[PDB]
Amino acid sequence: DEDETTALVCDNGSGLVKAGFAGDDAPRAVFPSIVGRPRHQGVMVGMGQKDSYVGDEAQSKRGILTLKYPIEHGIITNWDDMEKIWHHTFYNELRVAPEEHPTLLTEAPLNPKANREKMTQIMFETFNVPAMYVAIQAVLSLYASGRTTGIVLDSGDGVTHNVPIYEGYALPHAIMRLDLAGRDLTDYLMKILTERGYSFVTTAEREIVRDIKEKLCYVALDFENEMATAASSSSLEKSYELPDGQVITIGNERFRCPETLFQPSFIGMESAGIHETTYNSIMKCDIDIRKDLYANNVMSGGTTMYPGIADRMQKEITALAPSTMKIKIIAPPERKYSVWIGGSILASLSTFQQMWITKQEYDEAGPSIVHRKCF
Amino acid sequence: DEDETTALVCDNGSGLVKAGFAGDDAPRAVFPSIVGRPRHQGVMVGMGQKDSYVGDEAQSKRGILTLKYPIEHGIITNWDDMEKIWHHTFYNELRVAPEEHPTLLTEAPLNPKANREKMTQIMFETFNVPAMYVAIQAVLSLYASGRTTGIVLDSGDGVTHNVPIYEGYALPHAIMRLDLAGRDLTDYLMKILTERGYSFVTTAEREIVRDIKEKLCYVALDFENEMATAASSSSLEKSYELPDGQVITIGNERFRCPETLFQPSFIGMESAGIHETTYNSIMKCDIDIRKDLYANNVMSGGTTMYPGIADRMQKEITALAPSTMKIKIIAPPERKYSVWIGGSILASLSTFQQMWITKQEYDEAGPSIVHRKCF
Amino acid sequence: DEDETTALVCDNGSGLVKAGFAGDDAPRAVFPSIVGRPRHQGVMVGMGQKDSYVGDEAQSKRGILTLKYPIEHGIITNWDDMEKIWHHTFYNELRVAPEEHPTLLTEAPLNPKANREKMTQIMFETFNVPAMYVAIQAVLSLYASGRTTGIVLDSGDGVTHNVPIYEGYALPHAIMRLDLAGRDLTDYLMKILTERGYSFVTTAEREIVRDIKEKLCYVALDFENEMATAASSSSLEKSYELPDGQVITIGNERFRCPETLFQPSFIGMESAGIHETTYNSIMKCDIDIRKDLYANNVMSGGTTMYPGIADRMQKEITALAPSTMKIKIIAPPERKYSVWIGGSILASLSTFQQMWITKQEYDEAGPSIVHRKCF
Amino acid sequence: MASGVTVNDEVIKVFNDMKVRKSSTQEEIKKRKKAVLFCLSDDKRQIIVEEAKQILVGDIGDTVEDPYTSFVKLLPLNDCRYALYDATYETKESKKEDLVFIFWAPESAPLKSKMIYASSKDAIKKKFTGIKHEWQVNGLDDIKDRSTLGEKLGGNVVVSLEGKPL
């Protein structure tokens, strides 16, 4: 007989929070981790159970709200709105109180100690949850890929990070994070459509430019040729209908946006590209391990959904790495929910349940307990 | 006239260059030895001018230059950019020509004959110098502590050297090095500030982190004791003002940085710390000479300007060394320039007239003269 | 008669173990005798099957362990982790039951004699072995070379022994040691690679410098002759590729490393080199027999596998030995296993049944049975 | 409610049956059945043993050249698992036969079996002392011949793997 113990799974990722139940292979809810408090000039009355709108609602009713970001760098800083975000997720989007269901969170590479201890607090206090865990993003993706050593290049809407893995443990002093993310791709994608005269500036147009990002974009190989091909052949130009039947067309901008991870300096950053960041993080690991990292580059994160990226990374790493090395890029099928698909299956394992990180080991061991079950 | 005695002194150090005239109290310019090679022509110059930009110029042009450190391991690993450091030191920063002025140089511990010889060559064949000398900077800082015998820890930004000396001569069978230095403290300091969400990624922000190193950092007298005191107060924490007019405040992270010198494992090195390496260096010195080194551990260089370091070293080496020995940490009063100031005094002693290698002592034996005249 | 046990031949060495079966052509297990314990702790209960990681399992544990050898001289300094070395050799590396199969052992030149009685105990108590035998290592390689009188210079793992022998009897007044060998010269190669500005510092990098040393080092035919040849011939230096595809040039360091065994003062020691300890051990033997020892100078152990060393050994001692004498340096191909091959044969001679100490002879004659029957 | 699925110590017992060379008359002739599988349980919380799709010892002297040749095309494509091997190799410095852990993880296996058998991978490896070599397989071809095991033990053993050259 199978256990009734269905756990809740929440990925905090970067930018986009993603949630569902353990046993589902895809999230039931996905939204941007944004919150908006009213301004006292033009304050609304009769809204929610709280002082601030969250997610899509905060962008659906603009101008009057002063928007605030509770996460940036992929790391949690605010908790007074993050504990609203989780509540609105459980009690309004997923339709349950989490009091029967163990709850698994995802950790970002190089997350401060105490943020796991605050994750133990709010689950057992604020939300009344019976048990928890916290698992680091890059291991969840590499284990779900079916590998045991290599480097994960992960790329979401808040940050992009390169994480070397050895046996299953991440080498911490070898990690790199690039600032360049799906955020800055949206900043750029709006502006370069505006350079074609298709001006997009509002919160309503931003999410259509995000819908275009998630549809029509791809990484170019050998950039100047793809630019010249678009500038001489409408074969690379593609059309889109805006919400009320008005039509646009996008070409160069479909790959000139994705290219900003290989050239951050095309938005304006001092930062080196994803291939250079991959090379510099491999070159910060030990002499005998580097061979297996060059040969095991895992692509992760929702911005690696673009065609041509692994195909391009094969060119870009062989321009940096010794030609005696034999560069395999591992591009998995799922990439958006990469860490959540690993986390969902981890959250269904009840192997050690009766002395774990349960709600009533807390009155004895306090919030310190979390680090004693972290491998 | 007769009170002036015209000579120059350029300390190369452990890669932290310091230069002035023989008779200056403190050096007239101080900078890291780095050359920035540009990716375009005319970026800081008109056409038909210098190829590559040095130190001050290099960090001033973020994103648009690539750096090389020529004297990385304290020994000179590259001449084609080290030749530019010296040329720019004379014909830019000091504002004087070396053809007229005797120039005293420093050498770092463990330097090959060929590098001593090639540096003696450059002074005459690239710089015309009337006379020169090559002094080992650790002995200049030992003499600035008013000693003949002792054990000098040189700790700049390139490498940290443990140099045991008996009556002016460094004991080469017992010299040790910890390749962790003030470079890697500056790099690690950016990461632990990024654990507090502060933007510290760029070359522009990095050189502000080098000021936070001088201004805000200290060694904890015991680490987890200082950690437990900081984690139970709001009093250890110190503020910093950024050059755009924004303000930040740093807590526990003020002592996470330089603890790396006692625990190299904070940056993933399985190496021994500044306490352990100095202790091992004394223990590989023979029978009774060790008592005289134990009582005379000289701290030298910029990384010895931190509060609590001497007090901490006085704890750590009395825990390592059998307490029947009377262990003393000491230092020169000023110590960040002591390595150069002892050269200033040496290059202005009127009796040093015969000890200067005058350029026609190259005629008789080429660059090998430095093994007969530079003790 | 034809369904009996092929006895094990397990040489205890000097910091490298060598163990195989009697009548087999080679040692099955060859591994370091190094043992380590953790400096910092994990949380994953049940994943450590031992307190101490022994052998290649120690070298595996990147900055976790502090490492130590229990057998620095070939004389055991810690017996209780050496008790685990043999246990790990049988129940891991050789893959055999020691309670089923007899074991022949070795003892190091001039060992403090209670050493071999505790060696008889541990076999018959802790490993419960049915039959045992012990031999002095220099009285194996001499008989593999077809001698009985001669002077075996064994430059093993950790110390170089000189053993003058006459008709199998090792002359006790004539023996000596130089406390330096092919282990401790490897870390000396790391320092003179650091003179070129290469980094090698970790236990992982040590095993590459160990590999570089055994593949590329040689003894110079004369030091200053080969230094003058190196200065006039750039073809002296040569390449080595690291396993990630980075490449370096290993230079005159190829002989400056081995030369420190002919000149110990280069690592800071009082002692004269292997030529002069050979001369001094022969010159401590009685009036004539000088004759037969100079004519039978056998090199043994791993550090004698270098080119130029037989050539060089003859070169020095022909200036020291009274000029009527005609020295013969013996340099056979299998030098590290000459001290094993003759033991494989001995432990499978059918008529050796009465020379083996069986379990029952440990009672009446006591643990001291080893002083009745074993050389 | 867990970090992974647990190791059940019968895997260490049947590993101990293969672990040692022993007494002539039966043990070597019967126990050294190379390519035994370690697999996920009924409840999905334990790694256990499954009787693999191999041959024993005397049967190598007949219609099959080696037991790896049995194994490498009797593995599931739609699942992951671990395999234990006992790889005979020559150099010309010595003749070894050493124990190897193999993680079979073909891309056609689902992400949840991949995630599960990855979770417990380190635990079973850190229990089996005297495994000298370990690797992971991902295609259907990187598995195939006996010599394709050899650079995974380390490229010095290229002379002979299971009696076959690399």
Curated annotation (Swiss-Prot), chains A, B, C:
Compartments in which it is found: Cytoplasm, Cytoskeleton
Stretches of the chain forming a coiled coil according to its record: none
One GO CC term on file: actin filament bundle
Gene Ontology MF term list: actin monomer binding; ATP binding; calcium ion binding; calcium-dependent protein binding; cytoskeletal motor activator activity; hydrolase activity; identical protein binding; magnesium ion binding
N-acetylaspartate modifications at: D1
Cytoplasm among keywords: yes
Top enzyme category: hydrolase
Pfam family, one: Actin
Residue(s) carrying ADP-ribosylarginine: R177
InterPro entries: Actin, Actin/actin-like_CS, Actin_CS, ATPase_NBD
Residue positions where Tele-methylhistidine is found in the record: H73
Modified positions (N6-methyllysine) in chain numbering: K84
Stretches for region Interaction with alpha-actinin: 110-123, 358-370
Keywords: Acetylation, ADP-ribosylation, ATP-binding, Cytoplasm, Cytoskeleton, Hydrolase, Methylation, Muscle protein, Nucleotide-binding, Oxidation
The keyword Nucleotidyltransferase appears for this protein: no
Modified residues (Methionine (R)-sulfoxide): M44, M47
Reactions catalysed: ATP + H2O = ADP + phosphate + H(+)
EC number(s) reported in the record: 3.6.4.-
PTM notes: Oxidation of Met-44 and Met-47 by MICALs (MICAL1, MICAL2 or MICAL3) to form methionine sulfoxide promotes actin filament depolymerization. MICAL1 and MICAL2 produce the (R)-S-oxide form. The (R)-S-oxide form is reverted by MSRB1 and MSRB2, which promotes actin repolymerization.
Broad class of where this protein is predominantly found: cytoplasm
Subunit structure: Polymerization of globular actin (G-actin) leads to a structural filament (F-actin) in the form of a two-stranded helix. Each actin can bind to 4 others. Interacts with alpha-actinin. Identified in a complex composed of ACTA1, COBL, GSN and TMSB4X. Interacts with TTID. Interacts (via its C-terminus) with USP25.
UniProt xrefs under PANTHER family: ACTIN
Family: Belongs to the actin family.
Note: In vertebrates 3 main groups of actin isoforms, alpha, beta and gamma have been identified. The alpha actins are found in muscle tissues and are a major constituent of the contractile apparatus. The beta and gamma actins coexist in most cell types as components of the cytoskeleton and as mediators of internal cell motility.
Function: Actins are highly conserved proteins that are involved in various types of cell motility and are ubiquitously expressed in all eukaryotic cells.
Protein name per the record: Actin, alpha skeletal muscle
From Swiss-Prot, chain D:
Name of protein: Cofilin-2
Residues recorded with modification N-acetylalanine: A2
SUPFAM superfamilies linked: Actin depolymerizing proteins
Result when mutating A35T: In NEM7; protein is less soluble when expressed in Escherichia coli
Family: Belongs to the actin-binding proteins ADF family.
Region spans: Interaction with CSRP3: 2-55, 55-105
Principal subcellular localization: nucleus
Post-translational modification: The phosphorylation of Ser-24 may prevent recognition of the nuclear localization signal.
Motif Nuclear localization signal, chain ranges: 30-34
Statement: the UniProt record of this protein carries the keyword Chloroplast: no
Family annotation (InterPro entries): ADF-H, ADF-H/Gelsolin-like_dom_sf, ADF/Cofilin
Disease: Nemaline myopathy 7: A form of nemaline myopathy. Nemaline myopathies are muscular disorders characterized by muscle weakness of varying severity and onset, and abnormal thread-like or rod-shaped structures in muscle fibers on histologic examination. Nemaline myopathy type 7 presents at birth with hypotonia and generalized weakness. Major motor milestones are delayed, but independent ambulation is achieved.
